[PDB]
Every structure is written in C-alpha cells, then in structure tokens.
Amino acid sequence: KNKCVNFNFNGLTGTGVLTESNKKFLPFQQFGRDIADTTDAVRDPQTLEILDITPCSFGGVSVITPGTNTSNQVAVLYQGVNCTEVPVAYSTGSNVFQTRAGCLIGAEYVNNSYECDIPIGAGICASYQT
Amino acid sequence: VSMTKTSVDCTMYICGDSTECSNLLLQYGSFCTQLNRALTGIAVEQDKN
C-alpha cells in the first residue's frame, strides 16, 4: 500500500499507487470507475475492503535556463509533481522548492518581488542575479 | 480572455506503460512532438492574452 506497483486484481492488470479507500461498495461489486469511465478503485478479494487505484505520479520536465551566452547554470521544474516524489529520479538537492506548479530545483526562493523574467506559472517567475 | 492550458503526453496516451507500443509509435517519429508543439503553442498564448 501507498507504493507504486504493477497490480493485477482478478486479471485487471495495471500500474498505480494502491491506497485504502473511504468509498463503500455494495456486496455484488468488485471495481469502481471515475467520471472518465476509467477504473479508480477495486475490492481486495481475499479480505473484502476497497482500495483506491491512484495513478503513480508523472509530469512534464521543464528546464529553466538563462542564455548559454550568460551561463551554463540551469534549474529544473517537474510540472504537477509534488517535490517528495522527485528524489525517485539532482536528487542530491541542496536547493529545492515545492509550489503550486510542481517542484523547482537548483533555484533560490527570494521574498523580494522583482518583475517577472522567466515565467514558471502560478505567480512564480525565475531570473539570474547576485 | 483565456482558456485552461493543457499539456498531453502523446506517448502515455497512446502507449502508457508499454515499450512494445513505444517501438511501434517510434515508426511514426515526429507526430507526437508535432502535437506537443501545437499544445505548447496554445498554452503560452494563455499567458500572452
């Protein structure tokens, strides 16, 4: 539970973070499906309880760069990804930050609102300064 | 004024969790990047608008 795995329930093969559900199913059901008409929960068939199939985390990897003509220094964004997950992959860290956009690595969060330079999203921007 | 930005993993959509589908998608080459450019182009103008 709460781990990414290649499950098989009654032949329902897939990949997910299995989790304990607070849904309750009527006795004749084995599965649940979301709005999208896609499976999101399943019954443990030896010891009847409902499990949420959350998908294992994924996202776009966006690279933040000045010009090469300015510096070789770069910082990386993992879009939609909670920073706790990113060390699965720079996982040495030292400079890291979790935001509404995802996780930002190699850049320093500063309280001073400068004008936007490179747009990150969700009101964040990033830039190169002393 | 704007709309919801979206970004789509064309590989994960058509071949999520499969190398075997991946090696067949590899026959088609550029089309998933061409889609990703098209979507990314839209998403940038939602900041611009």
Partner: peptide, 25 residues
C-alpha cells in the same frame, strides 16, 4: 460559473493567479 491525469493529461496553471488578476483589475 460551476466547473484525466493518468492518460498523460495535465491542466497547467496560468502565470497570473486569480488574485493577480484581481489586483490588475
């Protein structure tokens, strides 16, 4: 007004928040 993920579908955030839009407004 009254208002996917696992197929690789992602709803990226706007650069301006609804709060920043309220500030400009």
């Amino acid at each position: 007004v009254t208002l996917q993920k696992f197929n690789g579908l992602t709803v990226l955030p706007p650069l301006l928040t609804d709060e920043m839009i309220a500030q400009y407004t």
